[PDB]
Amino acid sequence: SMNPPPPETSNPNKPKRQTNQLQYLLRVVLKTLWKHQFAWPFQQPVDAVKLNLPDYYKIIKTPMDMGTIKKRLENNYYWNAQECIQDFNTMFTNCYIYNKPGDDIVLMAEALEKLFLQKINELPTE
């Protein structure tokens, strides 16, 4: 297909924990970004077939998106907050790798990244 299988949202072996920080990442951080007017291109895996982007998965080998992150949080997939933060960060840098710098999709990502940094600056102490 052009589309790879989507990133997993569960795993038989990967260990997990629940923490107040992971709860905050779902209830506050993911929620705040998800409701933003510019969230919609980031709420699901890039569908290269639908969007006609034959080069996307030639370039992006570690895809990530907030739909996957939301499911990972809901499924208790993460061991700690750092693992979840890493997924957000991958989502943003993938956008900057793939896209032309002046593209509106990059402007959208940048607005969401600025909000994300504000929210992570208030990550509660564990």
Footprint on this chain of ligand A1LZF (rule: CB under 6 A) = 41-42, 46, 51, 53, 95, 98-99, 103-105
**Total residues belonging to the chain:** 126
Q: How far is the CB of 15 from ligand A1LZF (least distance, A)?
A: 29
Q: How far is the CB of 98 from ligand A1LZF (least distance, A)?
A: 5
Q: Directed axis angle between helix 66-74 and helix 81-98, to 10°?
A: 170
Nearer to ligand A1LZF, 11 or 44 (CB): 44
Nearer to ligand A1LZF, 105 or 120 (CB): 105
CA distances from 126 to 2, 22, 23, 27, 96 (A): 41, 9, 11, 15, 31
Please provide the distance, in angstroms rounded to a whole number, between the alpha carbons at the two ends of the chain.
42
Nearer to ligand A1LZF, 106 or 123 (CB): 106
